[PDB]
């Protein structure tokens, strides 16, 4: 591939592992989710710019617009979780076991 | 390289003033002194984000006016702005832009 | 498997070439069964709403039967077309590759040796 | 919720799924999924209670993660082939993430732990959308990229789904959880025959949607969500118990009902490819599904459970629920075996 | 695979045109109306051959016309031209509209001394035709023969032989 | 899993029993870690020390079963001079099944495990002889 | 050492990811994601993407990340695991950097090279425009379908969030 | 597509950005326009089962223009050989390479 791709590709892996291992806060994981889209944004832009894929120069912007809209929907749920149990801890969200 | 030096100088200068500001008066020796989530604020931030994203789709308009398909380009340009105004109307009528409990 | 067929018009319920095939008869056994299904749906409609099963809503029962037969007629028309296409492709492919489908050499039972296993 | 906003949100759920099915570009496929997840959360939060809030959160995190993996597969596929077309992927690593992203969205084992819990925390009408409509979009993509899916991966996810759906359902009394595990079990059948004959993946999907929609509709009519509450139906609407018996028997694959057709055709398309061990193991493990279906038939229609005194006040009012297409769905769920050769319309 | 063939260091040598971008930009309009024929032959060569090694001889002809073009200015209009590109060279953007007064003198000088007419707005951007004896390439992409298509299915669509033939169904 | 299985099937049956046992012990040991990997994840141990005790317990029980299958099934093929014989695997499967009962402290599990593990092992040997396929490659 | 600016930035890019991936307090986690975003734009700028790089600052850092920090300060109530994860992350980064700088070839899932990012850049360009800008401006002439679906999704985002946050 | 609505209606919803050799604004080409064109014209109409065998030569060239894997191996070899001879007194870079 190339030398830069290794770190971008390894940055996605770090964020994925970070998202799959919650500690206590729900806000912490949403950041790991928005880190993933940042790595995908940079990785796609590197590919498109280097190959002179002109019409694909708009794709990274579309990736950013939808990923931010999804992030907004994520924060709204976090707020409604905090207004119920007083904190954004994931251990509280355990009613559905039974 | 020029833009890199300009950023380095500005932030390096700011750091110096900050540290010498926390130390220059400490060259002096003064005797030791001793001894609710709001929903409406959150909705302003989220409304700004969705509006801010729609602005991202409008920034390339000046370049988009150089095309040979002005009829198509002018149709979609007025569609995005009209849709952005429709979002404002929905929040306005649904009491989104209010600060009274 | 029959998706990228050479003779194809995508996203068409009944291509033009299907009109050269005989239509399903209005007395088709499959079409009578589809109509019978519509009638059964009518009776259940009365039962779940606590109406007289056999008599209530004869006008409603008539549209249950007609809609099933109407939809059933076209599905059967497409069913017989897709099977006609399969045979059409199967036979054309056999002509194009005669070496892969040779004419079997036929030997009478007087000469072919089959082992005998007695039951004793 | 305002009725007009309810229609608008529903049409956006449909539009998201339709965009996935009419798109020849991976970006529009991804956009289709995003528009679909954005619109379905409000119908899960509509009842405004902690359980709904928890269910919507567990669904968002699962579907958000799945969409990120899918977009990673698309970019890897762009680097190694320089195109966006919705077809076979050109890198084995892209195929794995793509196959795993779709598995998470579908709810296949071992990416299954959210289906029982999300379906339990939302109303019946929201569960009906979740278990039937939300499965169309991922299956459409699998129909198109199956030539490059890793065989051992897709067949391994299929086998686990059949097992975990079976064992999970035995230990359930809540109706919403029983359908959730039933949904996991039937997914394994759809993806087991996918490498061999994708046409039978659609047939099993169509039949599953019809049968599942019939069950949820009958539960919604009597507002029943527990096994016991369903056992009072014989004393309120006797006809509805006979329809539940027939559908439950159909879902179990017992001939001569409709639910035997897909299990019948999938076993045919696998023995043609000299697959004998897998269809037998799949068919035998499906008897677990027939068991906890039969248990509901014993407490609903084949025995008369105890009733309560206040039930007598219900006899004086009719059913005002919509029960849309219930007469038509129930007949299609039971009396379609003689029309099996009609599956060619799906080719 | 193969070995990339490259021309020799003596096959590329030619007398360069060593004048700054301001000098070229001052003479651009007259230059394009005088050396059009050798110029367009070279460009037709490049867009057709798609290989710079195939159009080296046309390239040298482009250089020679430019050298001869500037010598004529060197003989008749030197001071007017030297004063024209000095004003162009002063601006960071090398604007024409800042030097209309000096342009007229240079434009008039060439008109009298050489009969050169400055092309009008929109002339140098026109598609033109060039008569060349170089044969048209047959396989410019060096592509191989395409794989032959599948046999096409043709004939009459007759009904299925005994129907679906699905297990026991008779139609 | 692809490379280790090749090692087991490359060795002809009833020979080099030391290497076959090592191959079987590896597979069972791996299957033990996979099981204990999910057990720790879904059922949190009370402490780190308790976690490693569980992971070691499952890993040894799984590795003990596989160790005795390859050893027992390879010795049997030697004394009987019958490589292509499923009965060799039946003895190995049941021998491994008893070990499972031994670790669980139950005679019922040992008897049930011996019967079913032994039956499954015999089928595996039959498939290798006759080329049965669990994940068949699409052909038609 | 200025020829390897892109690789140096990428190394800082990863270190920031190990920062907030270890999940310190949300206040510091968001701080680390701002650093990675700024470094991320730096990489995109050096590949020729100026509009895309600046769009990261305006929309990602000055947009979403401000809402993240704004929501953290209002709904977050201002260990060994954090340090353990953070140290584990840096070590893997160091070894990946160490090997790709020793033999200039590393194989982890993919075959990566270590010559330098500059070796793949295009060698010819004489246009009177920015190729990146032309593509993005094509959103209005070519991307009619994209504009409609994107705009509708943003409009539905407004409707959906108000529904979720009403609470009654 | 699962449903070919675009082909039925003759409307180009998203086929304009699928490939990098399609029509680009101002006729700006991609770096691998020639290679993509050759592979597309080789594999057209014969299905992907055949194209994986009868158009492998073109595909390998296309993938070589995308990731440039083979070229970087060759340059890497030359750099090592020059470096090895450099630290032995056995090589002398010419004036125009320094
Ligand atoms: C062959 C395949 C055949 C299988 C077909 C299966 C259809 C079965 C539908 C379930 C039966 C309806 C029912 O019992 O009501 C439950 C429920 C109402 O019960 P509720 O929870 O008390 O009320 C909810 C709110 O409180 C709302 O309360 P409200 O008072 O505010 O009312 C809002 C307004 C709202 O009115 C509407 O519902 C209209 C909305 C537009 C529907 C789309 C129209 C399609 C044409 C345009 C394209 O009125 C209603 O809600 C009417 C009650 C619902 C009956 C109408 C349902 C029509 C469904 C048939 C079309 C199927 C298209 C897919 C469904 C959408 C997928 C997300 O209505 C639903 O939301 C069910 C949604 C259906 C999802 C499953 C669709 C099947 C998926 C397979 C599709 C075929 C592919 C294979
Ligand atoms: C609204 C659409 C979403 C709801 C329906 C989702 C059902 C999913 C089940 C699979 C689809 C059924 C098979 C499609 C089919 O055969 O009919 C399409 C038929 C035949 O399409 P086709 O034979 O060209 O192939 C496309 C569909 N696949 C690939 C799945 C076979 O086309 C039409 O009927 C469209 C014409 C009518 C226009 C309305
Ligand atoms: C088809 C799918 C295959 C599934 C196989 C499942 C095997 C389960 C074995 C469970 C045995 C067990 O746990 O011990 C319980 C029992 C002991 O349970 P117990 O000692 O607690 O008492 C049982 C009696 N009652 C119920 C009254 C308490 O083990 C046995 O003794 C059964 C021996 C089985 C012998 C195996 C023959 C297999 C033939 C083929
Ligand atoms: C379970 C059963 C569920 C049944 C649900 C109803 C689905 C079938 C409804 C068919 C209704 C027929 C309407 C009249 C048909 C007609 O007159 O044609 C017009 C139009 C398509 O015609 P067109 O393809 O455009 O021809 C143009 C040629 N120049 O007509 C059309 O729009 C085409 C019909 C649209 C629906 C396509 C459905 C095809 C897939 C079948 C799904 C059901 C398969 C069930 C299989 C069960 C197996 C036992
Ligand atoms: C060969 C010598 C060993 C055998 C000796 C036998 C004597 C008895 C001792 C038993 C030992 C059993 C171990 C056998 C495993 C090794 C043999 C094998 O089959 O290989 C499997 C795997 C090999 O690992 P790999 O580096 O990929 O080798 C590539 C070779 N092609 O090796 C494995 O790791 C398999 C074990 C499962 C690994 C996955 C477990 C989950 C990992 C995630 C951990 C949890 C998530 C991490 C974060 C949690 C927080 C810390
Ligand atoms: C695989 C996932 C391992 C994991 O991270 O689980 C945590 C577990 C012990 O964590 P614990 O101290 O119990 O957490 C506090 C709860 N009171 O961690 C463990 O128990 C350690 C399990 C790893 C054993 C590796 C043996 C080789
Ligand atoms: C990978 C291969 C290594 C296994 C994975 C390493 C983690 C497990 C080793 C744990 C060592 C330890 O301290 O515990 C001893 C362990 C069993 O632990 P124990 O407390 O005795 O529990 C009851 C067991 N019947 O003793 C054991 O039996 C562990 C044996 C490991 C497997 C060898 C085959
Ligand atoms: C062909 C080439 C050869 C290939 C290698 C052959 C060797 C195969 C090795 C077999 C691996 C078996 C995997 C199971 C490992 C044991 C799992 C385990 O650790 O738990 C066992 C479980 C313990 O439960 P318990 O201790 O009571 O609860 C503790 C709570 N703290 O106690 C139990 O409940 C036991 C239940 C286990 C049942 C699982 C199914 C048995 C394994 C199926 C395979 C059968 C075939 C094996 C024979 C060889 C086949 C070729
Ligand atoms: C931990 C325990 C797991 C390890 C124990 C099992 C290991 C042995 C089975 C794995 C496959 C072994 C294998 O690679 O060979 C397959 C075998 C013959 O194939 P082969 O060895 O390659 O011979 C040369 C052919 N050229 O062919 C066969 O194996 C035939 C298989 C016959 C199966 C009979 C068993 C009945 C039960 C059916 C279970 C299968 C369905 C469940 C699948 C689960 C998938 C998640
Ligand atoms: C590949 C390499 C992966 C393994 C690298 C291990 C990196 C993690 C370092 C260990 C660690 O995080 O600390 C111990 C861990 C959690 O930290 P701990 O001290 O237990 O916090 C609560 C104490 N009361 O304690 C645990 O629970 C163990 C978690 C698994 C490690
Ligand atoms: C050589 C390989 C074996 C070596 C270890 C043997 C071992 O350990 O056998 C012992 C084990 C189990 O012992 P346990 O229950 O832990 O003993 C201690 C019990 N307490 C803790 C209660 C005191 O017996 C078994 O489970 C097998 C018993 C049933 C025999 C069935 C044989 C026929 C099966 C086929 C027909 C169904």
Swiss-Prot record, chain A:
Modified residues annotated as N-formylmethionine in this record: 1
Q: Can you tell me where the transmembrane regions are?
A: 1-21, 29-49, 61-81
Does the keyword field hold Coiled coil? no
Q: What InterPro entries does the entry give?
A: NADH_UbQ_OxRdtase_chain4L/K (IPR001133), NUOK/Mnh_C1-like (IPR039428)
The membrane topology term of the UniProt record is: Multi-pass membrane protein
| Statement: the UniProt record of this protein carries the keyword NAD | yes
Q: List the disulfide bonds.
A: none
Q: Which UniProt keywords apply?
A: Electron transport, Formylation, Membrane, Mitochondrion, Mitochondrion inner membrane, NAD, Respiratory chain, Translocase, Transmembrane, Transmembrane helix, Transport, Ubiquinone
GO MF, one annotated term? NADH dehydrogenase (ubiquinone) activity
The catalytic activity of this protein is classed by the Enzyme Commission as: 7.1.1.2
Recorded superkingdom: Eukaryota
GO BP: ATP synthesis coupled electron transport
Q: What does it catalyze?
A: a ubiquinone + NADH + 5 H(+)(in) = a ubiquinol + NAD(+) + 4 H(+)(out)
Q: Where in the cell is it found?
A: Mitochondrion inner membrane
What Gene Ontology cellular component terms go with this record? mitochondrial inner membrane; respiratory chain complex I
Q: How does it assemble?
A: Core subunit of respiratory chain NADH dehydrogenase (Complex I) which is composed of 45 different subunits.
Q: Which family does this protein fall into?
A: Belongs to the complex I subunit 4L family.
The free-text function statement in the UniProt record for this protein reads: Core subunit of the mitochondrial membrane respiratory chain NADH dehydrogenase (Complex I) which catalyzes electron transfer from NADH through the respiratory chain, using ubiquinone as an electron acceptor. Part of the enzyme membrane arm which is embedded in the lipid bilayer and involved in proton translocation.
Q: What is this protein called?
A: NADH-ubiquinone oxidoreductase chain 4L
- The gene from which this protein is expressed is MT-ND4L
Curated annotation (Swiss-Prot), chain E:
- Disulfide connectivity? 35-65, 45-55, 77-109, 87-99
Kindly state the positions of the motif Cx9C motif 3 in this protein. 77-87
Stored Pfam families: CHCH
Q: According to Swiss-Prot or TrEMBL, what is its membrane topology?
A: Peripheral membrane protein
* InterPro entries assigned to the protein according to its UniProt record, in alphabetical order: CHCH (IPR010625), NDUFA8 (IPR016680)
The domain of life is Eukaryota
Location(s), subcellular: Mitochondrion inner membrane; Mitochondrion intermembrane space; Mitochondrion
UniProt subunit comment? Complex I is composed of 45 different subunits.
Q: What is known of its domains?
A: Contains four C-X9-C motifs that are predicted to form a helix-coil-helix structure, permitting the formation of intramolecular disulfide bonds.
Role according to the record: Accessory subunit of the mitochondrial membrane respiratory chain NADH dehydrogenase (Complex I), that is believed not to be involved in catalysis. Complex I functions in the transfer of electrons from NADH to the respiratory chain. The immediate electron acceptor for the enzyme is believed to be ubiquinone.
UniProt protein name:
NADH dehydrogenase [ubiquinone] 1 alpha subcomplex subunit 8
Gene name linked to the record:
NDUFA8
From Swiss-Prot, chain F:
**N-acetylalanine PTM sites in chain numbering:** 1
Coiled-coil residue windows: none
Q: Which gene encodes it?
A: NDUFA11
For whether the record's keyword set contains Transmembrane helix, the answer is yes
GO cellular component terms, alphabetically, are: mitochondrial inner membrane; mitochondrion; respiratory chain complex I
Question: What's a Pfam family this protein contains?
Answer: Tim17
Among its keywords, does the record have Ribosomal protein? no
User: What's this protein's family per the entry?
Assistant: Belongs to the complex I NDUFA11 subunit family.
Q: How does it assemble?
A: Complex I is composed of 45 different subunits.
What does this protein's UniProt record list under function? Accessory subunit of the mitochondrial membrane respiratory chain NADH dehydrogenase (Complex I), that is believed not to be involved in catalysis. Complex I functions in the transfer of electrons from NADH to the respiratory chain. The immediate electron acceptor for the enzyme is believed to be ubiquinone.
UniProt-recorded name of the protein: NADH dehydrogenase [ubiquinone] 1 alpha subcomplex subunit 11
Which keywords belong to this entry?
Answer: Acetylation, Electron transport, Membrane, Mitochondrion, Mitochondrion inner membrane, Respiratory chain, Transmembrane, Transmembrane helix, Transport
Localization per Swiss-Prot or TrEMBL: Mitochondrion inner membrane
Residue spans crossing the bilayer = 21-42, 57-79
Bilayer topology reads:
Multi-pass membrane protein
Q: Name one GO biological process term.
A: mitochondrial electron transport, NADH to ubiquinone
Swiss-Prot record, chain G:
Q: Give the E.C. number(s).
A: 7.1.1.2
Topology with respect to the bilayer: Multi-pass membrane protein
Instruction: Kindly report the protein's main subcellular placement as a broad class.
Output: mitochondrion
Q: What class of enzyme is it?
A: translocase
- Molecular function GO labels: NADH dehydrogenase (ubiquinone) activity
**Task of the protein:** Core subunit of the mitochondrial membrane respiratory chain NADH dehydrogenase (Complex I) which catalyzes electron transfer from NADH through the respiratory chain, using ubiquinone as an electron acceptor. Essential for the catalytic activity and assembly of complex I.
Q: What is this protein called?
A: NADH-ubiquinone oxidoreductase chain 6
